[PDB]
């Protein structure tokens, strides 16, 4: 009965009394695995700090009858559900934390977290009288992901918000169980990372003189210099912070495109590099490909970043070469195909991409990039194709074309991350990517045969920042879309259920308020008719019946036990709204319950549903629903009437 988000993948209900922590309650671990052991220290810390219960860390043994304690096993059981499964065990007598590693008990403390008041995350109040209840009876969970990668994306690079904000997104990820934190931290405006070999990668590229303000070619500027940067000691705190909380971290170093800011830092980089830093969010200074000095840089920059990363999989980007403005008519460019008989601009980039990849493996590391490295045309600027093969150990994060296109990569071979930008772009506005279409996106591309769906790892939400330089605005865009991905990425795909989220939903809104997440407030919609698909039809409106306020419809066959039903007036189409008055049940030819309230369906929906109390069925009779309803200044209205039982 409870509310976590993501929904766990199994769940099963027993009758009784929940566990209660109290301030008798223990954390006791039944393992001496020095991982285990660990997670028992900090979620020690983590649960006291936001319940004010003490729950000693005591040895495996003797708990008191007093209390429920949480007791913490290795269990091998779940290890072919990989390593973030867990389970849960919740009774009077105990909860029971159980993973095949050490990283599945940090999420059953996340979830457990879930099923708890949201006045943990209280900043201030006394606590001493609530009641620490896991959910609210006996239950076991078995729970695990359905992809392994599970990322959001922030893009510091654009505008930078530093060690503070990425931290509080890190906390919001973690208790959404999202595994891959994607930093975005080099591009055309912004140069994030330090490196110690080239100091002017931070001293020029992290400051710019103005930002172009709300949106391209607006001909809006701030006119305030923005600078920022992450040394390498803070990334190797936020590297610990992360992985103390299941996230491993993903850095992008852009290329061979979204490279100004590299090149005004070292001119040689680029054969157009920029006067200055871009103040623009238009200009994408191209890394020339045919010179040595390129590939020597690159690959001394990722040396650093190899130091202070240790994820296997480090991001090169690859999106958006402008081949047309950046290397058509060059002449190092045309020398260079000619001599390596080059037919187009993708060969060049291909080129790098390969030797990109190369560079990378030697370092012990996996390539991942925007799925131009591929090799296809993508965005129409004057590219071709690719003669030759993309590298096929690199990762392919796929965000724009045709979804045929994805499944040719994995069919060669590839390991796909799903970040379609038409669902996963959270810089985009509500109206152009609402939260029930973030929801409703499944990573598995269409018509992709079963044996090539263990390539698809995951999806990516990205939030790229052009028009976010506060973290308030980033909440906003982020928050609740994130909520809805990490559902996607986490629950089975049959599991998933858009009204059961959106409830689910409002109270995890009161932990992001008290967590001083700034999410948008008015974006979840009460009613979707998707919510409907369904649910009973009982009856319709049309112009025709408006010409009469009662309307009556069948539902016999739908009364089967006591109880209360929903009756919910959907508008469809048409100039005018319905106004309705009251709805009632009716036994045989008699009343027999009633809801009298001004409702209003239209494209607006104004308290649309009425619930109407069922006797026990009498054997023999009829049942009806009774609604008064007219045309609101008109009788040009569709609408479907719905029947809801318990
Ligand atoms: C053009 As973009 C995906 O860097 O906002």
Redesign the pocket.
């Given at each position: 009965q409870e509310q976590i988000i993501p929904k766990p993948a199994e769940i099963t209900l027993f009758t009784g009394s929940p566990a209660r922590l109290t301030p008798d309650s223990l954390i006791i671990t039944e393992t001496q695995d020095k991982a285990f052991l660990d997670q028992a220290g900090q979620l020690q810390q983590m649960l006291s700090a936001g319940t004010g219960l003490p729950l000693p860390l005591k040895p495996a043994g003797q708990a008191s009858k007093k209390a429920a304690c949480i007791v913490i096993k290795k269990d091998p059981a779940l290890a072919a559900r990989g390593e973030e499964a867990y389970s849960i065990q919740s009774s009077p007598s105990g909860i029971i934390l159980s993973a095949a590693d050490a990283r599945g008990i940090f999420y059953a403390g996340q979830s457990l977290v879930q099923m708890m008041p949201s006045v943990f995350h209280d900043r201030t109040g006394d606590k001493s009288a609530v009641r620490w209840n896991i959910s609210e009876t006996p239950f076991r969970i078995t729970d695990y992901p359905r992809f392994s990668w599970r990322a959001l994306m922030i893009?510091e690079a654009?505008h930078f918000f530093g060690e503070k904000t990425i931290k509080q997104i890190i906390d919001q990820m973690a208790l959404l169980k999202m595994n891959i934190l994607h930093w975005?931290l080099t591009?055309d405006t912004g140069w994030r990372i330090e490196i110690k070999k080239y100091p002017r990668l931070t001293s020029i590229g992290s400051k710019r003189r103005e930002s172009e303000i709300g949106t391209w070619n607006s001909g809006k500027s701030d006119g305030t210099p923005h600078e920022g940067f992450y040394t390498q000691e803070q990334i190797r705190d936020i590297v610990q912070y992360a992985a103390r909380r299941n996230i491993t971290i993903v850095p992008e170093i852009e290329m061979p495109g979204?490279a100004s800011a590299a090149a005004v830092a070292y001119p040689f980089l680029s054969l157009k590099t920029p006067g200055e830093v871009p103040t623009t969010?238009i200009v994408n200074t191209a890394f020339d490909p045919t010179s040595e000095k390129t590939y020597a840089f690159l690959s001394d920059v990722l040396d650093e970043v190899t130091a202070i990363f240790p994820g296997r999989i480090i991001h090169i980007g690859g999106?958006?070469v402008r081949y047309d403005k950046q290397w058509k008519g060059v002449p190092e460019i045309e020398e260079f195909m000619k001599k390596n008989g080059m037919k187009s601009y993708a060969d060049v980039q291909m080129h790098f991409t390969n030797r990109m990849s190369g560079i990378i493996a030697q370092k012990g590391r996996r390539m991942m990039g925007w799925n131009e490295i591929y090799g296809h045309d993508v965005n129409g600027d004057g590219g071709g194709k690719a003669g030759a093969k993309l590298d096929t150990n690199a990762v392919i994060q796929f965000?724009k074309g045709n979804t045929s296109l994805a499944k040719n990569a994995i069919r060669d071979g590839h390991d796909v991350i799903n970040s379609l930008?038409t669902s996963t772009?959270l810089?985009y506005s509500y109206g152009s990517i609402p939260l029930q279409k973030a929801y409703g996106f499944e990573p598995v591309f269409p018509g992709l045969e079963k044996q090539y769906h263990s390539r698809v790892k995951g999806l990516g939400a990205?939030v790229?920042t052009?028009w976010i330089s506060t973290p308030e605005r980033l909440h906003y865009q982020a928050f609740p879309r994130a909520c809805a991905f990490a559902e996607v990425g986490w629950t089975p795909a049959g599991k998933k259920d858009f009204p059961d989220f959106k409830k689910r939903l409002k109270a995890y809104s009161e932990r992001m308020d008290l967590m001083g997440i700034k999410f948008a407030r008015n974006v979840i919609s009460q009613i979707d008719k998707s919510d409907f698909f369904n649910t009973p039809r009982i009856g319709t409106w049309t112009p025709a019946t408006l010409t009469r306020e009662e309307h009556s419809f069948d539902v016999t066959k739908l009364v089967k036990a006591s109880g209360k039903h929903t009756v919910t007036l959907l508008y469809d189409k048409g100039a005018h709204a319905i106004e309705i008055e009251s709805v009632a049940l009716y036994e045989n030819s008699r009343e027999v319950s009633r809801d009298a309230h001004a409702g209003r369906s239209g494209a607006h929906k104004e308290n649309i549903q009425y619930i109407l109390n069922a006797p026990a069925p009498r054997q023999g009779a009829t049942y009806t629903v009774k609604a008064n309803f007219k045309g609101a200044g008109g009788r040009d209205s569709h609408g479907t009437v719905y029947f809801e039982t318990p």
């Open positions: 893009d654009r975005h591009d979204h969010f999106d958006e965000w930008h772009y810089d990205q790229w052009e």
